[PDB]
Amino acid sequence: TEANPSNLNEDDARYGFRCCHLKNIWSAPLPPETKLAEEMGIESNSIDIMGLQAAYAQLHTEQERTYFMQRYRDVISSFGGSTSYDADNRPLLVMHTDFWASGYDVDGTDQSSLGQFSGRVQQTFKHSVPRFFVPEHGVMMTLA
Amino acid sequence: TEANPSNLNEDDARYGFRCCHLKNIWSAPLPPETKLAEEMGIESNSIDIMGLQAAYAQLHTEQERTYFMQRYRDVISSFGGSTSYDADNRPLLVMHTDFWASGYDVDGTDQSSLGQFSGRVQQTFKHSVPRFFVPEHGVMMTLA
């Protein structure tokens, strides 16, 4: 929520915000507040099986959300609807490319460096954005 | 489990062990220890519907077993696997035939036996075992 670029700390303001590690078992867990048990009210000696029914259904709607519908758009999409980018005021992803950065090793050639190697990563790349129609004044931002 | 042929009783040792009657409603019931109700722990005023869930699933695995997976091989086969006869040290059924034994009646022909009949069951039969490759020293036993 940082109001101004001055509410930003040393590292961030200069280098950009941090992002998430590539998804794996520990870097992409289930939202921490994930329900691990759903309690349902019971009388003292009886249980409304018809209620227990709704109970589950209700839980469902809750999980569906927790798991993958935390954003409004996702909820709507869930019903089989749509949402303009103007609906939840979201940047419009115009283009997204990616690649693996490879390179080569430089060999050591002097008395002590001979047999040593330094890696010089160095990958070329294109990032093309198809003609795009800009409906309203704004900004086209490209980040890496 | 009888250790030696001498731990065997009169009848058995001479005639062979007893087997089960042809399957019918009373000769082929459900394993006597079959679950007739599955209890699940509940707090005092609430119930974990998510737990109640696993609870059922768990029961399932238990029943699947009780009903038809009491033998290791059957359990594995259940996953869609297999098991050498050497896995659970089981005899290898090489061939199994069967038939109905019919015969005829002999008629009584004397003053008092005339009109009486004795049944002489007497059925012929073949029991053929296709060429079989014996991988290790052993025994080929054929029982009736």
mmCIF file of C-alpha atoms in Angstrom:
data_model
loop_
_atom_site.group_PDB
_atom_site.id
_atom_site.type_symbol
_atom_site.label_atom_id
_atom_site.label_comp_id
_atom_site.label_asym_id
_atom_site.label_seq_id
_atom_site.Cartn_x
_atom_site.Cartn_y
_atom_site.Cartn_z
ATOM 1 C CA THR A 1 0.000 0.000 0.000
ATOM 2 C CA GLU A 2 2.995 2.380 0.204
ATOM 3 C CA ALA A 3 1.647 5.861 -0.504
ATOM 4 C CA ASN A 4 4.724 7.579 -1.986
ATOM 5 C CA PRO A 5 8.080 6.332 -3.419
ATOM 6 C CA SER A 6 9.599 7.710 -0.216
ATOM 7 C CA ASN A 7 7.727 5.318 2.064
ATOM 8 C CA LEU A 8 9.828 2.736 0.249
ATOM 9 C CA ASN A 9 12.983 1.317 1.851
ATOM 10 C CA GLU A 10 16.558 1.428 0.548
ATOM 11 C CA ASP A 11 16.553 -1.922 -1.312
ATOM 12 C CA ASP A 12 12.990 -1.779 -2.708
ATOM 13 C CA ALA A 13 13.088 1.751 -4.121
ATOM 14 C CA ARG A 14 16.349 0.998 -5.927
ATOM 15 C CA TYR A 15 15.845 -2.596 -6.990
ATOM 16 C CA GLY A 16 12.101 -3.247 -7.091
ATOM 17 C CA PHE A 17 9.894 -5.347 -4.816
ATOM 18 C CA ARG A 18 10.734 -8.953 -4.096
ATOM 19 C CA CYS A 19 8.765 -11.692 -5.785
ATOM 20 C CA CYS A 20 8.052 -15.314 -5.003
ATOM 21 C CA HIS A 21 10.546 -18.112 -5.543
ATOM 22 C CA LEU A 22 9.734 -20.546 -8.334
ATOM 23 C CA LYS A 23 6.838 -22.682 -7.177
ATOM 24 C CA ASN A 24 7.836 -25.895 -5.357
ATOM 25 C CA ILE A 25 6.499 -27.772 -2.310
ATOM 26 C CA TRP A 26 7.642 -25.148 0.237
ATOM 27 C CA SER A 27 7.533 -21.974 -1.864
ATOM 28 C CA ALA A 28 4.012 -22.571 -3.045
ATOM 29 C CA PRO A 29 2.045 -23.934 -0.110
ATOM 30 C CA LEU A 30 -1.642 -23.570 0.627
ATOM 31 C CA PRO A 31 -2.652 -20.127 1.891
ATOM 32 C CA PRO A 32 -1.638 -20.181 5.576
ATOM 33 C CA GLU A 33 -5.197 -19.586 6.788
ATOM 34 C CA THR A 34 -6.369 -22.787 5.068
ATOM 35 C CA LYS A 35 -9.115 -24.603 6.947
ATOM 36 C CA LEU A 36 -7.854 -27.801 8.582
ATOM 37 C CA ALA A 37 -11.195 -28.722 10.125
ATOM 38 C CA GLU A 38 -14.746 -27.391 9.912
ATOM 39 C CA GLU A 39 -16.793 -27.483 13.098
ATOM 40 C CA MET A 40 -20.581 -27.757 12.962
ATOM 41 C CA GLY A 41 -23.030 -27.103 15.793
ATOM 42 C CA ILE A 42 -24.759 -30.169 17.227
ATOM 43 C CA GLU A 43 -27.575 -30.362 19.774
ATOM 44 C CA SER A 44 -26.828 -32.648 22.703
ATOM 45 C CA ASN A 45 -28.063 -36.019 21.496
ATOM 46 C CA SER A 46 -29.053 -35.314 17.882
ATOM 47 C CA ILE A 47 -27.628 -33.914 14.625
ATOM 48 C CA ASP A 48 -29.452 -32.318 11.701
ATOM 49 C CA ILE A 49 -28.285 -34.449 8.788
ATOM 50 C CA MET A 50 -30.019 -31.992 6.487
ATOM 51 C CA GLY A 51 -28.066 -29.245 8.157
ATOM 52 C CA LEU A 52 -24.874 -31.263 8.044
ATOM 53 C CA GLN A 53 -25.618 -31.222 4.337
ATOM 54 C CA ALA A 54 -25.707 -27.484 3.851
ATOM 55 C CA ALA A 55 -22.757 -27.342 6.272
ATOM 56 C CA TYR A 56 -20.559 -29.182 3.783
ATOM 57 C CA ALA A 57 -21.839 -27.193 0.803
ATOM 58 C CA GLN A 58 -21.120 -23.995 2.657
ATOM 59 C CA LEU A 59 -17.595 -25.223 3.501
ATOM 60 C CA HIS A 60 -17.145 -25.889 -0.178
ATOM 61 C CA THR A 61 -17.861 -22.290 -1.196
ATOM 62 C CA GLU A 62 -15.393 -21.234 1.488
ATOM 63 C CA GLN A 63 -12.612 -23.552 0.248
ATOM 64 C CA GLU A 64 -13.157 -22.808 -3.435
ATOM 65 C CA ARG A 65 -12.439 -19.218 -2.412
ATOM 66 C CA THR A 66 -9.533 -19.808 0.004
ATOM 67 C CA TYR A 67 -7.785 -22.028 -2.552
ATOM 68 C CA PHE A 68 -8.125 -20.116 -5.792
ATOM 69 C CA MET A 69 -10.790 -17.432 -5.700
ATOM 70 C CA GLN A 70 -9.376 -14.831 -3.417
ATOM 71 C CA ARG A 71 -9.530 -12.123 -6.119
ATOM 72 C CA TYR A 72 -12.948 -10.717 -7.170
ATOM 73 C CA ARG A 73 -12.349 -11.442 -10.810
ATOM 74 C CA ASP A 74 -11.601 -15.108 -10.085
ATOM 75 C CA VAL A 75 -14.882 -15.384 -8.177
ATOM 76 C CA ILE A 76 -16.896 -13.975 -11.017
ATOM 77 C CA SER A 77 -15.032 -16.015 -13.624
ATOM 78 C CA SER A 78 -16.037 -18.931 -11.402
ATOM 79 C CA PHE A 79 -19.702 -18.347 -12.224
ATOM 80 C CA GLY A 80 -18.749 -18.262 -15.871
ATOM 81 C CA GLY A 81 -18.778 -14.504 -16.221
ATOM 82 C CA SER A 82 -16.114 -11.924 -17.032
ATOM 83 C CA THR A 83 -14.711 -8.648 -15.700
ATOM 84 C CA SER A 84 -13.236 -5.644 -17.494
ATOM 85 C CA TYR A 85 -9.775 -4.705 -16.293
ATOM 86 C CA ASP A 86 -11.543 -1.538 -15.171
ATOM 87 C CA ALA A 87 -13.757 -3.564 -12.807
ATOM 88 C CA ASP A 88 -11.117 -4.281 -10.184
ATOM 89 C CA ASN A 89 -8.714 -1.656 -11.543
ATOM 90 C CA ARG A 90 -6.055 -4.082 -12.661
ATOM 91 C CA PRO A 91 -3.084 -3.448 -14.920
ATOM 92 C CA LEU A 92 -3.558 -5.116 -18.270
ATOM 93 C CA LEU A 93 -0.987 -7.772 -19.056
ATOM 94 C CA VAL A 94 -0.220 -7.078 -22.672
ATOM 95 C CA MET A 95 2.670 -9.474 -23.189
ATOM 96 C CA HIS A 96 4.765 -11.908 -21.189
ATOM 97 C CA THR A 97 7.861 -13.695 -22.470
ATOM 98 C CA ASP A 98 10.551 -15.649 -20.621
ATOM 99 C CA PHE A 99 13.722 -17.659 -21.173
ATOM 100 C CA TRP A 100 16.700 -19.408 -19.645
ATOM 101 C CA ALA A 101 19.943 -17.465 -19.387
ATOM 102 C CA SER A 102 22.927 -19.562 -20.501
ATOM 103 C CA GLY A 103 26.521 -18.644 -21.331
ATOM 104 C CA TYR A 104 30.041 -20.056 -21.171
ATOM 105 C CA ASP A 105 33.075 -20.686 -19.035
ATOM 106 C CA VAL A 106 36.301 -18.755 -19.410
ATOM 107 C CA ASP A 107 39.361 -20.966 -18.839
ATOM 108 C CA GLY A 108 42.256 -19.999 -16.557
ATOM 109 C CA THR A 109 45.596 -19.939 -18.336
ATOM 110 C CA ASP A 110 48.266 -18.756 -15.872
ATOM 111 C CA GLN A 111 50.488 -20.722 -13.442
ATOM 112 C CA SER A 112 47.925 -20.595 -10.657
ATOM 113 C CA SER A 113 44.658 -19.978 -12.567
ATOM 114 C CA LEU A 114 45.309 -22.761 -15.033
ATOM 115 C CA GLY A 115 42.548 -25.255 -14.369
ATOM 116 C CA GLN A 116 40.121 -22.757 -12.969
ATOM 117 C CA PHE A 117 36.997 -21.453 -14.713
ATOM 118 C CA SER A 118 34.706 -18.446 -14.441
ATOM 119 C CA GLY A 119 31.152 -18.545 -15.695
ATOM 120 C CA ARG A 120 29.949 -15.673 -17.840
ATOM 121 C CA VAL A 121 26.178 -15.966 -18.176
ATOM 122 C CA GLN A 122 25.157 -14.054 -21.298
ATOM 123 C CA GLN A 123 21.870 -14.690 -23.130
ATOM 124 C CA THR A 124 20.408 -12.787 -26.082
ATOM 125 C CA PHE A 125 16.649 -12.381 -26.364
ATOM 126 C CA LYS A 126 13.649 -10.738 -28.063
ATOM 127 C CA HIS A 127 10.537 -9.512 -26.262
ATOM 128 C CA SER A 128 7.912 -8.632 -28.848
ATOM 129 C CA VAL A 129 4.592 -6.921 -28.152
ATOM 130 C CA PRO A 130 1.988 -7.216 -30.943
ATOM 131 C CA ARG A 131 0.308 -3.983 -32.108
ATOM 132 C CA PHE A 132 -1.847 -2.798 -29.215
ATOM 133 C CA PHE A 133 -4.769 -0.374 -29.153
ATOM 134 C CA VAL A 134 -4.531 2.164 -26.337
ATOM 135 C CA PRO A 135 -8.138 3.141 -25.437
ATOM 136 C CA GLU A 136 -7.274 5.759 -22.805
ATOM 137 C CA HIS A 137 -4.291 7.943 -21.910
ATOM 138 C CA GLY A 138 -1.870 5.912 -19.807
ATOM 139 C CA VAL A 139 1.444 4.075 -19.437
ATOM 140 C CA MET A 140 3.011 1.055 -21.061
ATOM 141 C CA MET A 141 5.353 -0.424 -18.483
ATOM 142 C CA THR A 142 7.766 -3.230 -19.111
ATOM 143 C CA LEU A 143 9.522 -4.974 -16.246
ATOM 144 C CA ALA A 144 11.938 -7.886 -15.860
ATOM 145 C CA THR B 1 -0.478 -74.496 11.368
ATOM 146 C CA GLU B 2 0.001 -78.164 12.363
ATOM 147 C CA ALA B 3 3.751 -78.743 12.546
ATOM 148 C CA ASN B 4 3.982 -82.475 11.747
ATOM 149 C CA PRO B 5 1.565 -85.059 10.213
ATOM 150 C CA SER B 6 1.307 -86.445 13.745
ATOM 151 C CA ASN B 7 -0.256 -83.302 15.195
ATOM 152 C CA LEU B 8 -3.097 -84.245 12.868
ATOM 153 C CA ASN B 9 -6.191 -86.032 14.197
ATOM 154 C CA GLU B 10 -7.599 -89.415 13.164
ATOM 155 C CA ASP B 11 -10.035 -88.182 10.475
ATOM 156 C CA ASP B 12 -7.856 -85.409 8.981
ATOM 157 C CA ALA B 13 -4.635 -87.390 8.575
ATOM 158 C CA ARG B 14 -6.512 -90.188 6.811
ATOM 159 C CA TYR B 15 -9.071 -88.267 4.795
ATOM 160 C CA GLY B 16 -7.741 -84.737 4.324
ATOM 161 C CA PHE B 17 -8.890 -81.441 5.829
ATOM 162 C CA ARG B 18 -12.497 -80.360 5.597
ATOM 163 C CA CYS B 19 -13.479 -77.679 3.132
ATOM 164 C CA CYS B 20 -16.342 -75.234 2.873
ATOM 165 C CA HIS B 21 -19.824 -76.189 1.735
ATOM 166 C CA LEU B 22 -20.893 -74.850 -1.647
ATOM 167 C CA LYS B 23 -21.499 -71.139 -1.263
ATOM 168 C CA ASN B 24 -25.081 -70.182 -0.323
ATOM 169 C CA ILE B 25 -26.634 -67.605 2.031
ATOM 170 C CA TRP B 26 -25.519 -69.364 5.247
ATOM 171 C CA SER B 27 -22.352 -71.123 4.073
ATOM 172 C CA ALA B 28 -20.863 -68.004 2.589
ATOM 173 C CA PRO B 29 -21.648 -65.140 4.940
ATOM 174 C CA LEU B 30 -19.666 -61.983 5.549
ATOM 175 C CA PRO B 31 -16.525 -62.485 7.636
ATOM 176 C CA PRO B 32 -17.840 -62.681 11.220
ATOM 177 C CA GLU B 33 -15.825 -59.657 12.354
ATOM 178 C CA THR B 34 -17.585 -57.458 9.777
ATOM 179 C CA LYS B 35 -18.145 -53.897 10.949
ATOM 180 C CA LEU B 36 -21.806 -53.208 11.731
ATOM 181 C CA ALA B 37 -21.248 -49.608 12.787
ATOM 182 C CA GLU B 38 -18.320 -47.189 12.751
ATOM 183 C CA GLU B 39 -18.045 -44.804 15.680
ATOM 184 C CA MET B 40 -16.369 -41.416 15.274
ATOM 185 C CA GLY B 41 -15.192 -39.093 18.040
ATOM 186 C CA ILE B 42 -17.218 -35.911 18.503
ATOM 187 C CA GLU B 43 -16.514 -32.926 20.750
ATOM 188 C CA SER B 44 -19.420 -31.986 22.992
ATOM 189 C CA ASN B 45 -21.399 -29.561 20.860
ATOM 190 C CA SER B 46 -19.562 -29.676 17.521
ATOM 191 C CA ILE B 47 -18.411 -32.145 14.841
ATOM 192 C CA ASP B 48 -15.553 -31.828 12.360
ATOM 193 C CA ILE B 49 -17.322 -32.367 9.048
ATOM 194 C CA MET B 50 -13.912 -32.420 7.402
ATOM 195 C CA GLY B 51 -12.912 -35.093 9.851
ATOM 196 C CA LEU B 52 -16.173 -36.940 9.371
ATOM 197 C CA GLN B 53 -14.998 -36.976 5.778
ATOM 198 C CA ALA B 54 -11.701 -38.727 6.309
ATOM 199 C CA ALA B 55 -13.548 -40.918 8.835
ATOM 200 C CA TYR B 56 -15.672 -42.410 6.064
ATOM 201 C CA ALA B 57 -12.741 -42.758 3.664
ATOM 202 C CA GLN B 58 -10.787 -44.540 6.344
ATOM 203 C CA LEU B 59 -13.746 -46.873 7.015
ATOM 204 C CA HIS B 60 -13.765 -47.609 3.322
ATOM 205 C CA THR B 61 -10.163 -48.847 3.272
ATOM 206 C CA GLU B 62 -11.055 -50.999 6.269
ATOM 207 C CA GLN B 63 -14.131 -52.551 4.602
ATOM 208 C CA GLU B 64 -12.468 -53.082 1.231
ATOM 209 C CA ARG B 65 -10.010 -55.194 3.218
ATOM 210 C CA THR B 66 -12.451 -57.007 5.538
ATOM 211 C CA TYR B 67 -14.658 -57.944 2.578
ATOM 212 C CA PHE B 68 -12.203 -59.118 -0.043
ATOM 213 C CA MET B 69 -8.638 -58.042 0.624
ATOM 214 C CA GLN B 70 -7.622 -60.072 3.594
ATOM 215 C CA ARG B 71 -4.700 -61.682 1.715
ATOM 216 C CA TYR B 72 -1.601 -59.562 0.899
ATOM 217 C CA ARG B 73 -1.752 -60.393 -2.764
ATOM 218 C CA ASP B 74 -5.364 -59.203 -3.012
ATOM 219 C CA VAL B 75 -4.367 -55.891 -1.427
ATOM 220 C CA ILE B 76 -1.590 -55.309 -3.887
ATOM 221 C CA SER B 77 -3.691 -56.439 -6.843
ATOM 222 C CA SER B 78 -6.114 -53.813 -5.544
ATOM 223 C CA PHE B 79 -3.632 -51.056 -6.373
ATOM 224 C CA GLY B 80 -3.275 -52.572 -9.807
ATOM 225 C CA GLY B 81 -0.020 -54.360 -9.135
ATOM 226 C CA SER B 82 1.003 -58.015 -9.079
ATOM 227 C CA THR B 83 2.792 -60.520 -6.843
ATOM 228 C CA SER B 84 4.967 -63.517 -7.682
ATOM 229 C CA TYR B 85 3.792 -66.740 -6.090
ATOM 230 C CA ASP B 86 7.105 -66.483 -4.254
ATOM 231 C CA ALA B 87 6.004 -63.198 -2.643
ATOM 232 C CA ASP B 88 3.544 -64.684 -0.172
ATOM 233 C CA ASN B 89 4.848 -68.232 -0.645
ATOM 234 C CA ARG B 90 1.717 -69.606 -2.229
ATOM 235 C CA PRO B 91 1.248 -72.880 -4.072
ATOM 236 C CA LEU B 92 0.774 -72.290 -7.768
ATOM 237 C CA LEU B 93 -2.577 -73.421 -9.100
ATOM 238 C CA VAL B 94 -1.620 -75.055 -12.351
ATOM 239 C CA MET B 95 -4.966 -76.535 -13.336
ATOM 240 C CA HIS B 96 -8.473 -76.861 -11.955
ATOM 241 C CA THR B 97 -11.249 -78.940 -13.501
ATOM 242 C CA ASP B 98 -14.615 -80.032 -12.105
ATOM 243 C CA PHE B 99 -17.767 -81.942 -13.006
ATOM 244 C CA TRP B 100 -21.036 -83.436 -11.846
ATOM 245 C CA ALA B 101 -21.059 -87.106 -10.903
ATOM 246 C CA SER B 102 -24.076 -88.914 -12.378
ATOM 247 C CA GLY B 103 -24.912 -92.604 -12.737
ATOM 248 C CA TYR B 104 -27.881 -94.969 -12.773
ATOM 249 C CA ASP B 105 -30.361 -96.923 -10.727
ATOM 250 C CA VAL B 106 -30.255 -100.686 -10.396
ATOM 251 C CA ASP B 107 -33.755 -102.207 -10.277
ATOM 252 C CA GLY B 108 -34.850 -104.759 -7.668
ATOM 253 C CA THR B 109 -36.086 -107.999 -9.184
ATOM 254 C CA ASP B 110 -36.926 -110.424 -6.353
ATOM 255 C CA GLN B 111 -40.190 -111.001 -4.425
ATOM 256 C CA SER B 112 -39.391 -108.342 -1.849
ATOM 257 C CA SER B 113 -36.854 -106.138 -3.695
ATOM 258 C CA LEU B 114 -39.010 -105.846 -6.781
ATOM 259 C CA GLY B 115 -39.882 -102.173 -6.960
ATOM 260 C CA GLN B 116 -36.863 -100.984 -5.072
ATOM 261 C CA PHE B 117 -33.851 -99.195 -6.566
ATOM 262 C CA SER B 118 -30.237 -98.562 -5.619
ATOM 263 C CA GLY B 119 -28.297 -95.658 -7.042
ATOM 264 C CA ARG B 120 -24.833 -96.336 -8.397
ATOM 265 C CA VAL B 121 -23.140 -92.992 -9.001
ATOM 266 C CA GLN B 122 -20.372 -93.554 -11.544
ATOM 267 C CA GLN B 123 -18.897 -90.736 -13.653
ATOM 268 C CA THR B 124 -15.954 -90.882 -16.060
ATOM 269 C CA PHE B 125 -13.689 -87.863 -16.423
ATOM 270 C CA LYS B 126 -10.463 -86.332 -17.776
ATOM 271 C CA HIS B 127 -8.260 -83.885 -15.881
ATOM 272 C CA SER B 128 -5.678 -82.481 -18.272
ATOM 273 C CA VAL B 129 -2.734 -80.276 -17.321
ATOM 274 C CA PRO B 130 -1.111 -78.379 -20.224
ATOM 275 C CA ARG B 131 2.690 -78.637 -20.565
ATOM 276 C CA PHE B 132 4.155 -76.805 -17.579
ATOM 277 C CA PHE B 133 7.636 -75.390 -17.025
ATOM 278 C CA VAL B 134 9.071 -76.276 -13.622
ATOM 279 C CA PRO B 135 11.497 -73.445 -12.687
ATOM 280 C CA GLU B 136 12.728 -74.944 -9.406
ATOM 281 C CA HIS B 137 12.904 -78.387 -7.799
ATOM 282 C CA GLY B 138 9.554 -79.163 -6.193
ATOM 283 C CA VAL B 139 6.285 -81.114 -6.153
ATOM 284 C CA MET B 140 3.299 -81.355 -8.442
ATOM 285 C CA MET B 141 0.354 -82.236 -6.235
ATOM 286 C CA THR B 142 -3.077 -83.133 -7.464
ATOM 287 C CA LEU B 143 -6.015 -83.331 -5.083
ATOM 288 C CA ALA B 144 -9.748 -84.000 -5.365
#
